[PDB]
Structures are given as structure tokens and as C-alpha cells.
Design a protein around this nucleic acid. Structure first.
Lengths: 45, 197, 77, 108
RNA sequence: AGAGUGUAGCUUAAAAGCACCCAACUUACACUUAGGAGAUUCAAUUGACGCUCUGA
């Protein structure tokens, strides 16, 4: 059960649009992140 | 009375891949997205095209490496969305039952030491496991001369499971094959303390 | 602005999600109680069959203070 | 009145606390790419704690650090039993949604 | 094979009260407001469908 609190949202009122950008740190582990300007793919050199 | 001292260990491989979202969760995903755009507070086309083609050029690693094998029960990667449990066939002098990895312990060795020994007793590998406490998770007693079996719990951090084609019959069971492989009540109730999730 | 049909769909969405997460929490609690009572009966049997091991069954491993374990991902290495 | 049987019927302060191997102070650190996911996981773990009757003291957050940003949360825990701690942290292990970093560090 | 037997999680409650959950206010919890699901195992006090224990 690793999805019960994944369908959750920000509970504030001052904020801009957030998008599900896929991110990889160093080894190819794609994870959704709430990030501006949807890139759909991120990689740290 | 003569007592047969026996321990064991119900190893836990955690799911490296999160479970896929159900259509119910996806509908709630749409609802949460649209409420966000409702409750938010304030050449892009070229950037969007470049970013989408950057997304397309690299292929995402398959979340399910399971549909291709269909027979790699000995492989550590049999399942990814759920936890896995080690389970090795054993053949006794008077019995032949698909039994969770057991071990023999002496009063000079504590239960944690027995579990640590069992970690590498039967897998002959360099697996890395972690224990939480001395508390067991299941106790099952079958007599012929008393006897007992203590199913302990441990979690896999990393595993160098060399020579995967071992002479044993280690089959990773998540939840379903438990009953199929372990018939008697003393062994089919492992699901009570195995995290079904 | 919004419409009656989508409002009704949203209300039914809330209803079905209430039911679904109610079942989720019920099964989680069932597992909690099942394995807690399993551990309690295991400890009781250990006390009955070994008077010198229940004393060391309650002690705590000192290696859990710097505990570490990563969560799930999508693309394994 | 002192000499009557009803003496002390109104005293209340003794009911208010205005002030066996067990753990110490436990800090669970949750650093996550998403403010949303970090907050949701903090809520879930707090709900588990107050449903299992665990003394929770603080649920604050560390200041943000930039090097994108990672949001940090803290959960304080005090009071565990032998089997209870095992169940608690195994449940935490099994119910980690996606790419979250747990911790069982202590104070200071 | 035998015993205890039996209202949703609990009730020397008789279809109820506590429990329980999400939504909003909360960092968070809590409170509060809005909503949600829930049972007397089946046949005539009795017999037999399910759980626990005692054995093999």
C-alpha cells in the first residue's frame, strides 16, 4: 500500500501551478515531482 | 522432556516499485488536478516541444519485469509491486514438505544469532539483511518428543544473491502461492503475520 | 462556474472514496491486530518453553538508532 | 468540609498532570521532493501514532535548503514496546508511498 | 472427535451509544462544521452455519 497518501494535495492558498515532472537523480529512478514548467524528464549530472 | 529446538526466518524483500494506481485513484487524481487549477494563483511552445521530445527520446524503465519470465521463481526480481518472501523446499527423513527456511539452534546461541546464521546458512550468498527486534512473528509447534518452530522477521536492504541457479528450490512467494505451496495449517497461516498489504 | 451533473459526480466520488479508504483502514487494522496477537502468543509460548529467553526477548537492538531504508521507485537500477 | 465525608469531592488538580525496556526520544525525518507528499506522509504517520496511542510531541519542519528544493518534516515519538516498535517501523517501511526518506534519528 | 459458544471494533444497548474515516480550520494534532459505511449466521427456548480451545 504505497499509494494511500500519494493522491494528496497542497493545503495552502498562495501558490502557482504545479506539474508532474519525472525526475532521475543519478541512476535512472524516475519519480513524479510537483515541479513548475513541466519538463517530463530530469537528470542531475 | 526431549525438545527439538528449531528456529526460522520469514525474510521480507520490500517492493522496489510502488503499486500502480487503480482507476479509482486516477479519477481522484483528475479531481485533485482540476481543483488545483481552480484554486491556484497565477516562445514557450519551443521549450515545450524540446522538453516533450526529451521525454520521448529516453524510454522509461518498465515497472513490471514479470510478464516476460513466467517461470523465474528463483529470481530475486519475480515481483516488484509487492513484497516477496523466501521459501525453500526441504526433505526430512520422515517428511517432505515445502517449508519456510528453518534452522537448528542451541541454548548457547540466542535467537538473534540463530537468525543471523540462517541469513547465510542456506543461501550461501552475501545478502544484506536487517533485524528489527528479538520479538518473533509466528510460532508453530508440531510433534511426532516435543518441538517448536519460531518464524522470525527480517528485511532485505541489499542482496548479492550469487549463483542464482542454486541447487535448492528457493521460490519467492508474495501472498498467493503461500497456500498453494504450504498445505498444512501449521504452515498455511504464515499470511497472518506476513504483510499482505 | 460548475454544473449540477459534475457536482453530483464529485459527491459520488467522495462517497466511493470514503468507502474505499474505509475498507483500506479496516484491512490495515485487521493485519495490525492479527500480527500483534500472533507476536503476543509467540512471546507467551517462548516464556512457557524457555524461562531464560523471554528476559532477553524484550531487549532492543542498539543498531536501529541510525536506521536507514529507501522507499519504492518506478525504474529499478 | 474537612470533617464531612464529602471532603475533597471538588479537588481536580490531581487529575491534571500540569508538568520494562523502552526507547528514548525518536525523531523521524521526512525529506521529500514534494511538499504535498511530505505533508501527506506526516499526516498519515501522525494518524497511525495517535491511533496506536504513541506520545507525539512535535511535528515541525526544518528550513528549506537549495542546491530544486526538498521539503523536510519531523515527527517526534516517545514510548515503545518490544513488539510494538517492531510493528510500528515495519508498517512505516511497508507504507512508504514513493521515493521518501525516513529516519529514526534522535534528538541533538 | 469433544467443550465454549455467536449484535458492524467494544458494550450484565434493546436494532442504540461509543468507537472509525475523508472534506474544510489547522505545520501537524486536537476541537468544531459538513458528510460516509456499517451488524443480531440459517431453520423451528431448541437444532444445524462460522470462530476459539482441548487431540490425533
Amino acid at each position: 500500500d504505497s499509494s494511500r497518501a500519494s493522491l494528496t494535495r497542497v493545503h495552502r492558498q498562495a501558490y502557482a501551478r504545479l506539474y508532474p515532472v519525472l525526475l532521475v537523480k543519478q541512476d535512472g529512478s524516475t519519480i513524479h515531482i510537483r515541479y513548475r514548467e513541466p519538463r517530463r524528464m530530469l537528470a542531475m549530472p | 522432556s526431549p525438545w527439538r529446538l528449531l528456529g526460522a526466518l520469514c525474510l521480507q524483500r520490500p517492493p522496489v516499485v510502488s503499486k500502480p494506481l487503480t482507476p479509482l485513484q486516477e479519477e481522484m487524481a483528475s479531481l485533485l488536478q482540476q481543483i488545483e487549477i481552480e484554486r491556484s494563483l497565477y516562445l514557450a511552445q519551443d521549450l515545450e516541444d524540446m522538453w516533450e521530445q526529451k521525454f520521448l527520446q529516453f524510454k522509461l524503465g518498465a515497472r513490471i519485469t514479470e510478464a516476460d519470465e513466467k517461470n523465474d521463481r528463483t529470481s530475486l526480481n519475480r515481483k516488484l509491486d509487492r513484497n516477496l518472501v523466501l521459501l525453500v523446499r526441504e526433505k526430512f527423513g520422515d517428511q517432505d514438505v515445502w517449508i519456510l527456511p528453518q534452522a537448528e539452534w542451541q541454548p548457547g546461541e540466542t535467537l538473534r544469532g540463530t537468525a543471523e546464521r540462517t541469513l547465510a546458512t542456506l543461501s550461501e550468498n552475501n545478502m544484506e539483511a536487517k533485524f528489527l527486534g528479538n520479538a518473533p512473528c509466528g510460532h508453530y509447534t508440531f510433534k511426532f518428543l516435543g518441538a517448536k518452530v519460531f518464524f522470525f522477521k527480517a528485511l532485505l536492504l541489499t542482496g548479492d544473491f550469487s549463483q542464482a541457479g542454486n541447487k535448492g528450490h528457493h521460490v519467492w512467494v508474495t501472498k498467493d502461492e503461500l497456500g498453494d505451496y504450504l498445505k498444512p495449517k501449521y504452515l498455511a497461516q504464515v499470511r497472518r503475520f506476513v504483510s499482505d498489504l | 462556474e460548475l454544473t449540477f451533473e459534475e457536482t453530483e459526480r464529485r459527491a459520488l466520488l467522495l462517497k466511493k472514496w470514503s468507502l474505499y479508504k474505509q475498507q483500506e483502514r479496516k484491512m490495515e487494522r485487521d493485519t495490525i491486530r492479527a500480527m500483534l496477537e500472533a507476536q503476543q502468543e509467540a512471546l507467551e509460548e517462548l516464556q512457557l518453553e524457555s524461562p531464560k529467553l523471554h528476559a532477553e526477548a524484550i531487549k532492543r537492538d542498539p543498531n536501529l538508532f541510525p536506521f536507514e531504508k529507501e522507499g519504492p521507485h518506478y525504474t529499478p537500477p | 468540609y474537612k470533617t464531612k465525608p464529602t471532603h475533597g469531592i471538588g479537588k481536580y488538580k490531581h487529575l491534571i498532570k500540569a508538568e520494562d525496556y523502552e526507547y528514548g526520544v525518536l525523531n523521524i525525518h521526512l525529506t521529500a521532493y514534494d511538499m504535498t507528499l511530505a505533508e501527506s506522509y506526516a499526516q498519515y504517520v501522525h494518524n497511525l501514532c495517535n491511533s496506536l496511542s504513541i506520545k507525539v510531541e512535535e511535528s515541525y519542519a526544518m528550513p528549506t535548503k537549495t542546491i530544486l528544493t526538498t521539503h523536510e518534516r519531523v515527527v517526534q515519538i516517545s514510548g515503545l514496546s518490544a513488539t510494538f516498535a517492531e510493528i510500528f517501523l515495519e508498517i512505516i517501511q511497508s507504507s512508504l508511498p514513493e521515493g521518501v526518506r525516513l529516519s529514526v534519528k534522535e534528538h541533538t
